[PDB]
RNA sequence: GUGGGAGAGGGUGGUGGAAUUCCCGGAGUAGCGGUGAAAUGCGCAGAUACCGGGAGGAACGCCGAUGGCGAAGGCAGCCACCUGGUCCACCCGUGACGCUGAGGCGCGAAAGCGUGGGGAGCAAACCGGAUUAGAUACCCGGGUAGUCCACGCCCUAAACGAUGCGCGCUAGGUCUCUGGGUCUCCUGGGGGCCGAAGCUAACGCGUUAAGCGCGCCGCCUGGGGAGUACGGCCGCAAGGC
């Protein structure tokens, strides 16, 4: 066990889960969670709701490690990554700020057909 | 709208050739790395253009971004 | 390039009297030299294609210029055709 | 000949030696080259955008110089031969234009 | 001719950062992925998510436009070189040297062919999972050619403004890109919109003509049979005229 105690929190947003991995400050894991994580198996996972118990289970994970105060990550636009945002914004855990860091490229590779009419 | 300020308005004279100044340049650019719309810059289609050029050299030259992570949110 | 210099070179070369900028024998003579340069370099380049239409072009206009030349005074043709080395 | 500039960021991790080093083989590539220096800003260690291998800073050399411009791309290449050298920008110089004036 | 201008016009070499994938390492645990819902798939040989390092290929976010350049096809990170066109000012030179253009010659998106390479992502075909009455499809997981480079072929197209080229003539208004000027504005070259006169079957066009004229080329002659058959020419072939 480390117990840490200042961190970092990415909140991983698709259309389908949503992920939360609390890191220490090199960025290292050390609890995470999920729609899948908690008991949500299908499109469910995707839910704003479930990903508000995947954060706050992150949370308390990270509780254990006796964390205290963490600076947010926030990757992909997806639903319910506010809702994560929310749920860790009061989880008892301090939330000393967000940043949104969601990759684009500059064009370099084709999506698939479904992400097309665009590149 | 965009009508809170025209960064063009904030500085007088200066060199739109110049890409190794950095103080001046990141005036250009948003919150992130992006290169401001002309509604934002209050320049013309070749003050701009050129801007564009200039920027981009700094960037490579490693004294712009590229990109930037998004503050708050 | 061809420098401002290399220009006027060819331009008091060819003059048909002191100042003449524009006699057929003066344009024909740059016309020339544009045309050597733009082989030489699709010499190499073989692939750049839009340059070449220029210089079909180009000849195009070389031997509108002498035929009427040679329409109008075809000693000072074939003095002229001498002297460049054309015909090819 | 043409005129030019050549923008130079190097290690800033550089020692003295090795840094009047890579500024004399500079000089030395510059003169094989036939590069005439007009003049020189020596700005120094400044703060980069983004991390240059794996440096967060680096060192920065300007000079504009007089030189055969067929010449001009063999120049940059050797100015990058050296391991020291992180950034080779050469441009053709332009006279400077202006906003608000 | 001289002095200037803007430009993803072309070619060669270089180079930059973002992302994807893969490899290496750390930390970390039971799921990830995906959908309408799912399943196949992936993960305890430790995936996903996270940090660090590395390899490689392809394309260039913002700027970016209602924009620009090009004969067209088409052209977009940045840098240098090599190079085509074009516009403006001066009104300096030549003195009708002009226009068009059957044939010829060249260029010609994608796909496709040949010989080498390359191969990250995508992805015909194919292999699967679903959906369905069936589903040789739509959706999901894979995936080969191919997509990329060189060289040589192919010569097509809703190759579109479905509008051949040149010159003269016929209200304006408005926005815009780019020159020049005595720079409220004027003037020249492009790109748009609305509209005089006029045209048009109509829709619409209208100094960017689809108006008024002259010159030259191409083409049409009811729908189908048919872009077929036959012949010829070209092509390695596919196939093209
Ligand atoms: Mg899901
Ligand atoms: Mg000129
Ligand atoms: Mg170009
Ligand atoms: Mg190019
Ligand atoms: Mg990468
Ligand atoms: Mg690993
Ligand atoms: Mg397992
Ligand atoms: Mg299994
Ligand atoms: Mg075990
Ligand atoms: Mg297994
Ligand atoms: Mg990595
Ligand atoms: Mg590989
Ligand atoms: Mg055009
Ligand atoms: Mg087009
Ligand atoms: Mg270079
Ligand atoms: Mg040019
Ligand atoms: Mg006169
Ligand atoms: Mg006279
Ligand atoms: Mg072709
Ligand atoms: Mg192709
Ligand atoms: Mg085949
Ligand atoms: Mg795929
Ligand atoms: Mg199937
Ligand atoms: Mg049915
Ligand atoms: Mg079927
Ligand atoms: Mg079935
Ligand atoms: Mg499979
Ligand atoms: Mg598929
Ligand atoms: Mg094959
Ligand atoms: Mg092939
Ligand atoms: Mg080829
Ligand atoms: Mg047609
Ligand atoms: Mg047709
Ligand atoms: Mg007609
Ligand atoms: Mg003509
Ligand atoms: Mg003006
Ligand atoms: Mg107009
Ligand atoms: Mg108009
Ligand atoms: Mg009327
Ligand atoms: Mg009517
Ligand atoms: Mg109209
Ligand atoms: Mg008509
Ligand atoms: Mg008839
Ligand atoms: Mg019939
Ligand atoms: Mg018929
Ligand atoms: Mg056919
Ligand atoms: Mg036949
Ligand atoms: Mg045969
Ligand atoms: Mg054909
Ligand atoms: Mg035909």
Redesign the interface.
């Known amino acids: 066990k480390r117990q840490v105690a200042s961190g970092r929190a990415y909140i991983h947003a698709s259309y389908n889960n949503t992920i939360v991995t609390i890191t220490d400050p090199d960025g290292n894991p050390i609890t995470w969670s999920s729609g899948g994580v908690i008991g949500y198996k299908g499109s469910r996972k995707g839910t704003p709701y479930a990903a508000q118990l995947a954060a706050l289970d992150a949370a308390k994970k990270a509780m254990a490690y006796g964390m205290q105060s963490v600076d947010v990550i926030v990757r992909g636009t997806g639903a319910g990554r506010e809702q994560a945002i929310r749920a860790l914004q009061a989880s008892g855990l301090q939330v000393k700020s967000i940043v949104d860091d969601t990759p684009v490229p500059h064009n370099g590779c084709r999506p698939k057909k479904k992400f097309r009419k665009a590149s | 709208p965009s009508r809170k300020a025209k960064v063009?308005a904030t500085?007088?004279?200066?060199?739109?050739?110049?890409y190794?100044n950095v103080e001046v340049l990141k005036r250009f650019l948003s919150e992130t790395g992006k290169i401001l719309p002309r509604r934002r810059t209050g320049?013309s289609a070749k003050?701009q253009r050129?801007l564009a050029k200039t920027i981009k050299?700094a960037?490579?030259?490693?004294?712009?971004?590229?990109t930037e992570?998004?503050?708050?949110? | 390039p061809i420098t401002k210099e290399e220009k006027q070179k060819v331009i008091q070369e060819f003059a048909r009297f002191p100042g003449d900028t524009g006699s057929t024998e003066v344009q024909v003579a740059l016309l020339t030299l544009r045309i050597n340069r733009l082989s030489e370099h699709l010499k190499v380049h073989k692939k750049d294609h839009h340059s070449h239409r220029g210089l079909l072009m180009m000849v195009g206009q070389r031997r509108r210029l002498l035929r009427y030349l040679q329409r109008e005074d075809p000693e000072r043709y074939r003095a002229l055709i001498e002297k460049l080395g054309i015909r090819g | 000949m043409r005129r030019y500039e050549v923008n130079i960021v190097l290690n800033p991790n550089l020692d003295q030696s090795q840094l009047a080093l890579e500024k004399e083989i500079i000089q030395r590539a510059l003169e094989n080259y036939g590069a005439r220096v007009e003049k020189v800003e020596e700005l120094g260690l400044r703060r980069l955008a983004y991390p240059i291998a794996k440096d967060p800073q680096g060192y920065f050399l300007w000079y504009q110089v007089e030189m055969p411009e067929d010449r001009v791309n063999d120049l940059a290449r050797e100015l990058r031969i050296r391991d020291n050298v992180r950034r080779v920008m050469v441009v053709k110089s332009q006279e400077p234009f202006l906003a608000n004036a």
């Not at chain 2, 960037?59 to 590229?66: C, T, V």
């Not at chain 2, 992570?69 to 949110?73: E, T």
């Open positions: 063009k500085l007088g004279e200066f060199d739109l050739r110049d190794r320049l003050e050129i050299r960037r490579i030259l490693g004294l712009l971004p590229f992570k998004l503050v708050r949110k």
